[PDB]
Design a protein around this ligand. Structure first.
Ligand SMILES: Cc1ccc(-c2cc3c(N[C@H](Cc4ccccc4)P(=O)(O)O)ncnc3s2)cc1
Ligand SMILES: Cc1ccc(-c2cc3c(N[C@H](Cc4ccccc4)P(=O)(O)O)ncnc3s2)cc1
Ligand SMILES: [Cl-]
Ligand SMILES: [Cl-]
Lengths: 336, 336
């Protein structure tokens, strides 16, 4: 909330600029506006904010002029638009209903599958903003390359997930090797690496060793973030989190299920194969209870402590010559 | 067919390279292969070929080494991948059934809406190929900018079309101003301008006057191409064309309907408002017949002659200092 204020006020500009002497596309543009208003707003904006906070921590207080700052808030919003893009499109693919307690864009009367083209525009906006605000800067190409690669990392990932978890009831697919691989591609690169990485390029730090080291820390934070994300879906107090859960109820390849699958006598595979993915609550319950009887909440605690220790070693070994404050900023947030 | 041979043999490489020491994404990559094989192949490859033919016509026979040529066949394939991307995604949005006489990707058993992520990968491949083959070249950024802008031109366009023509039976929307605007954004930039424009950049011709002039010729060729595309859907002998038509049968904003709407007594608006968009053949027929009784086939002939004259004036006035052979190559094809 120290720099969240200005970030969200700058949105109104993002839209002003994306929406304008080419008269008869005017209507398409109208609709672009509606799209962004509804789909870019209403999150907690952490990823986009990471770019701003990191940019401030990374630069000479000298070279942080109004223009510099203009570009940090933008490239921050470019990340929130990348996300909206995956989110709109995944929500169609998963046949989701709500998101941020609010009806999904594609479920709205009159949108439906038009949401496909809408998502594509969310993505297109990224590269419009980069041209409008950074075409001049030494790191212009680096930012295009980054976003593009982050998109591809993410898409490869979603493909893996879909292949793993048919919305075709199968647990043989749900392995640790595979789960780590899904999380890395689908959530970790775009959620942890993209934003620090963007800030670094903006700072003129483009050595692929520096990035090699930053990615290493960040990708592991990404694993924890998701593994914690999967724990809370079930056991996390829904008021503390802000969501009912459908990890079991929707045949997801959770961390939970992966670890239960690693730790279960055949007689237990069945009770899981019997009620994982069912709509009935009676069924949703007799997995939860199996998880509880495998002390998995306790196995999570064990992983959280290890993970934590490890992030700090990685920060110790690889943050240099960046301020650890970049990493500890994130670590603080995610280890709540 | 003079240079179509090598173009289609080079595909096999395109795939070899897009699909490879990161072991557990291996499956996602498998699937990418399936995606491209099925969706990049089976067209007539005109747009991608335009890049190759234009590259040859545009360069010093000196500077056309194996490497140069390697990059022309690629950036040609980059265009065929852009198209596959719009095509897969539009075919979902339109609830289409077949395409190239062949079941659409999304209708295949096990694909469905996963086709969304599949289309996104088709698009991602463009930028992988550009990095793999051109990162070094002076025009690398120009080609990224071009493709990105061509994507956005196209998406803006599809948005306009969707807004115009709810798959909501309305003719008031179907105007000439609007039709020209749909065709320009949705089909003309990516089909005519992208490929000549790509070849020019590859040739080191990047002046925005040169491109200003090339786009002018090409966008008008784009209008004709589509306007002819809409004529043939109905009256075009389906063996000469290679498609049954559902321009009327699917409430499309055709050239036909636009011109019939411009030329019709109220008593005729009704007969159109009565049977445009109906599945029944009896209904599909009593529009066709209205079109015939408005001598629209004859109005098409009148437009084809004018259009033709005009393309040549535009070529006369704006081709320089490019070989007219670049433009007359296309004009020859499209004016069949
Ligand atoms: C780079 C980066 C850094 C921090 C975060 C955080 C997300 C988050 C958060 N998420 C919400 C959902 C959620 C995720 C994980 C745990 C609990 C709730 P949403 O996506 O509805 O804003 N909730 C509470 N604190 C945090 S911190 C994300 C990315
Ligand atoms: C830049 C550019 C230049 C020429 C073409 C052509 C397409 C085409 C063509 N299309 C087929 C469909 C069709 C379009 C227009 C008229 C008749 C058929 P498809 O997309 O199944 O390959 N058929 C016959 N000749 C041609 S020439 C496209 C782009
Ligand atoms: Cl400046
Ligand atoms: Cl070379």
């Amino acid at each position: 909330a120290q720099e969240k204020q200005d970030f969200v006020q700058h949105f109104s500009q993002i839209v002003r600029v994306l929406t304008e002497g080419h008269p008869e596309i005017g209507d398409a543009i109208a609709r672009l506006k509606e799209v962004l208003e509804y789909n870019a707003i209403g999150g907690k904006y952490n990823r986009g904010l990471t770019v701003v906070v990191a940019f401030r921590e990374l630069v000479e207080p000298r070279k942080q002029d109004a223009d510099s700052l203009q570009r940090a808030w933008t490239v921050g919003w470019c990340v929130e638009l990348l996300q909206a893009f995956f989110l709109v499109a995944d929500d169609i693919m998963d046949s989701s209903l709500t998101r941020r307690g609010q009806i999904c864009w594609y479920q709205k009367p009159g949108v439906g599958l038009d949401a496909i083209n809408d998502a594509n525009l969310l993505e297109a906006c990224i590269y419009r903003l980069l041209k409008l605000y950074c075409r001049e800067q030494p790191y212009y190409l680096n930012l295009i390359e980054l976003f593009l690669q982050s998109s591809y990392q993410t898409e490869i990932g979603q493909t893996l997930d879909l292949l793993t978890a048919p919305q075709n009831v199968d647990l043989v697919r749900f392995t640790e090797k595979r789960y780590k691989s899904i999380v890395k591609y689908k959530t970790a690169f775009y959620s942890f690496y993209l934003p620090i990485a963007a800030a670094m390029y903006m700072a003129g730090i483009d050595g692929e060793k520096e990035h090699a080291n930053a990615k290493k820390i960040l990708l592991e934070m990404g694993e924890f973030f998701q593994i914690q994300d999967d724990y809370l879906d079930l056991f996390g107090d829904p008021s503390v989190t802000g969501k009912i859960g459908t990890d079991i109820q929707d045949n997801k390849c959770s961390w939970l299920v992966v670890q239960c699958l690693q730790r279960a006598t055949p007689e237990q595979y069945q009770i899981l194969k019997e009620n994982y993915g069912q709509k009935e609550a009676e069924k949703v319950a007799r997995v939860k209870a199996l998880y509880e009887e495998l002390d998995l909440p306790a196995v999570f605690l064990q992983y959280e402590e290890d993970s934590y220790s490890h992030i700090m070693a990685l920060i110790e070994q690889y943050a240099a010559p960046l301020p650890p404050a970049v990493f500890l900023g994130l670590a603080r947030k995610i280890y709540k």
